[PDB]
Design a protein around this ligand. Structure first.
Ligand SMILES: [Br-]
Ligand SMILES: [Br-]
Ligand SMILES: [Cl-]
Ligand SMILES: [Cl-]
Ligand SMILES: [Cl-]
Ligand SMILES: [Cl-]
Ligand SMILES: [Cl-]
Ligand SMILES: [Cl-]
Ligand SMILES: [Cl-]
Ligand SMILES: [Cl-]
Ligand SMILES: [Cl-]
Ligand SMILES: [Cl-]
Ligand SMILES: [Cl-]
Ligand SMILES: [Cl-]
Ligand SMILES: [Mg+2]
Ligand SMILES: [Mg+2]
Ligand SMILES: [Mg+2]
Ligand SMILES: [Mg+2]
Ligand SMILES: [Mg+2]
Ligand SMILES: [Mg+2]
Ligand SMILES: [Mg+2]
Ligand SMILES: [Mg+2]
Ligand SMILES: [Mg+2]
Ligand SMILES: [Mg+2]
Ligand SMILES: [Mg+2]
Ligand SMILES: [Mg+2]
Ligand SMILES: [Mg+2]
Ligand SMILES: [Mg+2]
Ligand SMILES: [Mg+2]
Ligand SMILES: [Mg+2]
Lengths: 342, 342, 342, 342
């Protein structure tokens, strides 16, 4: 009798009121009985059609539900096994829900994430880091099996044209987004605005236990992403992106890959197929990204950033390896060592 | 010990070889034992670490698999419950696979559909009509809960700029795509080429038992769709589309809605938000569609088509109602009345 | 006193009524006299200011014009050389004007072209064939001198998705567009609709006096163009296109090049840089174009079309050479031999 | 005998060597004499053909030119009026040429502009401010007379994602672009990078003699433009833009309009039709522009900028009026008062 069962029965009802009259015609009443009764004889069935006929007026869904719930929970469940097979969903869709706890630009501000199970309606808090899938996987993959997958979830921490340095709080339960703290106050970029959507990939971690080719360990954070599309995102907004390449930034002695990606919703996504297409269609974009990350902390007392491969942006095949490997590291962190907070 | 278990263990292994060295270092050997052994003491554990140390040379995944499979299937399963929770997929992705049975443009030609379970690797034949989801539902829905869904699977039967009249064979098991037969020969449009991708929505049916507002029943086929993007699709190709509106075509006395939609991969999808945007950005497109469907059978001995609403293209809210209701009709056809073939 | 002179004086007037009060303030009246009066005697300047101050009410432009036209043709002549240098246009822009003489789809239908000189206001009829520039040349070319030009005027005779075979009438004075006549009636394609904007390049001619490399002479018509953008054009509409390549069609034994081009207003024009990009971004488009032109006359009793280079689409460099050479032929036809009608 | 005459004769030559054999066949030699010779005596035509036939080897253009230049200035004069009418260009296209005088980021750096007359080949230095047309006007306007014009030349001083404050030097002859000087050194924005292409409209001037509606005079500079397309421009690059709206910025007590525009080469230009479409397709763009200009000088010791209309972005109709009026002011500055340098 739970809300999940009610939705199943609601879809069942629609198969007998396809045109949404709002009620069951007499013919439809006999038909839903012939259907529910399929794993019965007439003993429990005779009692069923007689019961529904004795309802007063139009058999609305609401009255049909009432009739259904009035039966004994055991006998219901026998025929319900058929109903459930035909009318339950393949999987329960989870709606990502975002809530703010004010006040923005002060240390108290948080962006919290929840799941709303669309079948049960139950809400639970989740971690944008651990619980948002890194890979966007269709239940039924219709794109041809030849073309390989390139659809990643990107969590936007810092929208295009802004400079409040929001971050997934790796140290707090459920890892809400917060504003980073620098010199005791909420941190704003001093160098200038972030000129692309900036954020991170969920279910990745720049491991402090891994010696990257560059001779350093990781910066202890989710893998960083720069989304170069034309649309400004909201803080905490999550959207599907295509990975194009990656910059081997070494930041304060830690590996700090910067993945270049573009929203699958951008008008030029189709035409950007690897890192080399970015100079062709967005000349100066890669140079500006490399330079911004090279110098941005200098005005803050830091030093110029170093880069592996002499600052070369590696291609997408390489970037997806980097992401895959940080997914493994994240598996080791959360699944194996049970660390949900740093 | 099945292929599904092997993939689970392969992802497990990667969490202890994150950098893909191809083997387990000594430290990693102790760690995978501390992990597998978490629901054990030392009795079954002592036997475990001793067993893995006694492997010769580098513990490759292949040797790790061998060691794992050599244990007694019961004791394995106790710790495996933990492994399965951490490293099994949320759901099994199904790869849509298409096979042709030649020869094209003859009556023998068929396009068959299969599912390849990507975890088990098992293939089964499926119906493009019944088994391809009508609605494209993300497991975790990241688009904000306010913006409503508009992502439908479109099965292309007739590609842009062609005239071989392929159709889902509603009368055959597994409903392969075939070429329609007219006057004893494989059917080609006489009027001209189809100038947009033409096909159908899976899990819909223009019910022969429903009296549509127009005073007729349906044409006994899946709901028809015209995809107006610039890209030509392959025969049988399935892709995600956005519904914009619908034309109330009455064809030979049957309701024969023609849904106007556009590929979510087209460069101008973002800008087309309802049926009214089509004349703005694709002037003449709606007029040509209405006219082509109005007259195309006349040169074949048929009559001009009629249209409800005096030929008005209804908007997307209306088109999605039409699609929703034909989904209900399809539920009644397949689930309730158990008809997989017409 | 021409309307041309009036517009010059209107622009002069605006330079002293910059915010468009609609009239001259006293200080502005003194300033326009000091301007008109260099280099004249103080006698003529003071008398000039006096003539204008003696105007009744507000010195609107319309009254300023009146004063000017009443002024003596002598004093005018000396300063007007200055005025003309400062305020005359570099060249007179001609506005293309299109008029129909009904009735459409009958032999009487004509689309006529005119020029309206925006400075003199005089309208004169012109030939879309002879008088519309083949090359679109900016007065000041701002694109870098490195980038070679690829901006051509395309005259649409047959809009996307239509089949009325309109044509520039090479045989009639001013070469209006008419519907071709086949078998005594206005001609419609029997094969199907034209699925791209179809038309011709002005100031070109497939010479009947030239033996093309293919061993045949030309089809005696302007060079044919297929514009593959997503937007449908109106009959007779002229717009700027980018040339991509050309198909060496031989039609009924005559050279009948089919240039592939795309509108500079199309959303994907920037990404289409040569003929090879068409299969990348519009798969099937080239094949469909070749096939349509190969077979369309067969159903009319004609023969399959032939193609040079085995049906290969030559690239944009080759296509521009063909166009340049047909431009030379047109120069010989019109300028040298004075043939405006065939 | 000018290089201008040589190009005329080159085009004439091509009209008799249409396929570019590179020389004149005998029949073509007779034909060019019959052309040049109307209307002359048979004596002069036969002697002319004889002069050219008496040429050694193949009559290439280069030798044809030689023959022409040696011909007697009398006979030339009579036919050349015909030649000039048939083969001279409507107007001489000027190619914009840009030269740097290093060294960049020092006070010595200059970007100079030239015109190369494509017919005469003569190069002369020009002012990007005065000599580049504000309005982009086609010789033959093919867009329908209904559509009003919205095609302006934009001079980029500060490319997208940069912060070197380059400026048209209003104080120097020919008004080269230089880096602004602030506090004795070449000026860089302290606030951050300019996140859109920034520059100015040629042939405009924010007059110091005009009391703007806001109750202040102008900032004595060309009108400022922010180009919001996705493509980064080079310093000094000139390109055609579509005007969308304008921000009524008051900067240090002076009127300092900020016109919002977008490149006619941008993929989404067609879809942006007025200022209201910018929030539809580039959310946050307007807010970010207003805010950047509001605060950027504060970190330099300056004050927040003021805005007329409470910071509202006025629409494109209003923006074009502002531009038209600043064009009038520029006419008064340059043409009437002869001020090319401030
Ligand atoms: Br050009
Ligand atoms: Br224009
Ligand atoms: Cl998880
Ligand atoms: Cl995918
Ligand atoms: Cl910082
Ligand atoms: Cl199903
Ligand atoms: Cl959705
Ligand atoms: Cl048919
Ligand atoms: Cl025909
Ligand atoms: Cl190009
Ligand atoms: Cl010729
Ligand atoms: Cl500054
Ligand atoms: Cl517009
Ligand atoms: Cl002024
Ligand atoms: Mg940080
Ligand atoms: Mg980070
Ligand atoms: Mg960092
Ligand atoms: Mg980082
Ligand atoms: Mg059919
Ligand atoms: Mg159908
Ligand atoms: Mg039908
Ligand atoms: Mg149908
Ligand atoms: Mg013809
Ligand atoms: Mg033609
Ligand atoms: Mg032909
Ligand atoms: Mg032709
Ligand atoms: Mg300045
Ligand atoms: Mg300025
Ligand atoms: Mg200023
Ligand atoms: Mg300014």
């Amino acid at each position: 009798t739970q809300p999940m069962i009610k939705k199943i029965m609601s879809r069942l009802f629609s198969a007998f009121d396809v045109t949404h009259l709002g009620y069951l015609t007499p013919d439809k009443v006999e038909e839903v009985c012939r259907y529910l009764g399929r794993n019965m004889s007439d003993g429990d069935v005779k009692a069923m059609k007689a019961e529904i006929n004795a309802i007063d007026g139009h058999v609305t869904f609401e009255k049909f539900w009432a009739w259904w719930c009035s039966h004994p929970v055991h006998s219901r469940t026998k025929c319900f096994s058929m109903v459930s097979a035909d009318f339950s969903m393949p999987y329960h869709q989870q709606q990502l829900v975002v809530h703010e706890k004010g006040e923005m630009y002060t240390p108290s501000y948080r962006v919290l994430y929840f799941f709303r199970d669309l079948e049960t309606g139950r809400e639970r808090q989740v971690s944008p880091w651990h619980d948002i899938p890194l890979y966007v996987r269709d239940l039924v993959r219709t794109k041809p099996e030849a073309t390989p997958m390139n659809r990643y979830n990107f969590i936007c921490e810092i929208p295009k044209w802004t400079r409040a340095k929001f971050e997934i709080a790796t140290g707090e339960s459920f890892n809400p987004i917060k504003q980073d703290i620098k010199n005791g106050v909420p941190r704003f970029y001093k160098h200038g605005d972030m000129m692309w959507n900036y954020g991170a990939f969920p279910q990745t971690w720049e491991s402090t236990e891994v010696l990257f080719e560059a001779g350093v360990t990781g910066d202890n954070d989710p893998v960083d992403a720069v989304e170069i599309g034309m649309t400004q995102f909201k803080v905490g907004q999550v959207s599907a992106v295509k990975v194009l390449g990656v910059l081997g930034m070494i930041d304060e002695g830690k590996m700090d890959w910067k993945v270049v990606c573009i929203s699958h919703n951008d008008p030029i996504c189709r035409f950007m197929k690897d890192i080399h297409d970015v100079p062709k269609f967005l000349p100066g974009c890669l140079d500006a990204i490399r330079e911004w990350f090279r110098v941005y902390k200098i005005c803050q007392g830091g030093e110029a950033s170093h880069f592996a491969f002499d600052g070369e942006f590696k291609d997408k095949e390489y970037a997806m390896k980097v992401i895959d490997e940080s997914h493994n590291m994240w598996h080791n962190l959360l699944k194996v060592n049970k660390r949900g907070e740093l």
